[PDB]
DNA sequence: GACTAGATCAGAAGCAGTAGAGCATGCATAGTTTT
């Protein structure tokens, strides 16, 4: 949906943005949410989030992890911490339709292994790590973002 | 996931052939009238 009147995810989150924010760019991941369990349907069997069938009870959820512009302010060159803080003041999350990915501060390896073990326990792919001072470099790989899997 | 292509079956329309009905033409004969 390109307008609040008609869409599959936008008609519900039109009014989820604080009044001050008028121009806003966000980056995130789109996934499928099962409400009867209140759990995210892991990608794979029984559904594709690209061409979901209307009759299905599953719905679309947007998990945000970055902001690149708010009220004609260019946040590309700022540090990750600042972008996170500004992101916290964009929308009031409304579970099931738009959310912010939680990030935990960690400064030891035991924490990383604990997180990976817990992720495997919750049947997730893995865990990723972000450098607090990393800048957004479009199209580049392995600059401030790292991923870890079993 | 959305979309299309090819195979399959049935339904319906067109055409062929037959049977049944109706309408002209003749004439065969008898009946009636005239001389």
From Swiss-Prot:
Disulfide bond sites: none
Binding site for ATP: 29, 43, 65, 125, 130, 147, 149
Binding of Mg(2+) 2, residues: 125
Binding site for Mg(2+) 1: 29
Tissues where this protein is expressed: Testis, thymus, prostate and heart.
Domain of life: Eukaryota
Location in the cell: Nucleus
Subunit and partners: Interacts with XRCC4; the LIG4-XRCC4 subcomplex has a 1:2 stoichiometry and XRCC4 is required for LIG4 stability. Component of the core long-range non-homologous end joining (NHEJ) complex (also named DNA-PK complex) composed of PRKDC, LIG4, XRCC4, XRCC6/Ku70, XRCC5/Ku86 and NHEJ1/XLF. Additional component of the NHEJ complex includes PAXX. Following autophosphorylation, PRKDC dissociates from DNA, leading to formation of the short-range NHEJ complex, composed of LIG4, XRCC4, XRCC6/Ku70, XRCC5/Ku86 and NHEJ1/XLF. Interacts with DCLRE1C; the interaction is direct. Interacts with APLF.
Function: DNA ligase involved in DNA non-homologous end joining (NHEJ); required for double-strand break (DSB) repair and V(D)J recombination. Catalyzes the NHEJ ligation step of the broken DNA during DSB repair by resealing the DNA breaks after the gap filling is completed. Joins single-strand breaks in a double-stranded polydeoxynucleotide in an ATP-dependent reaction. LIG4 is mechanistically flexible: it can ligate nicks as well as compatible DNA overhangs alone, while in the presence of XRCC4, it can ligate ends with 2-nucleotides (nt) microhomology and 1-nt gaps.
Protein family membership: Belongs to the ATP-dependent DNA ligase family.
Disease listed for this protein: LIG4 syndrome: Characterized by immunodeficiency and developmental and growth delay. Patients display unusual facial features, microcephaly, growth and/or developmental delay, pancytopenia, and various skin abnormalities.
Annotated protein name in UniProt: DNA ligase 4
UniProt source species: Homo sapiens
Higher taxonomy: Eukaryota, Metazoa, Chordata, Craniata, Vertebrata
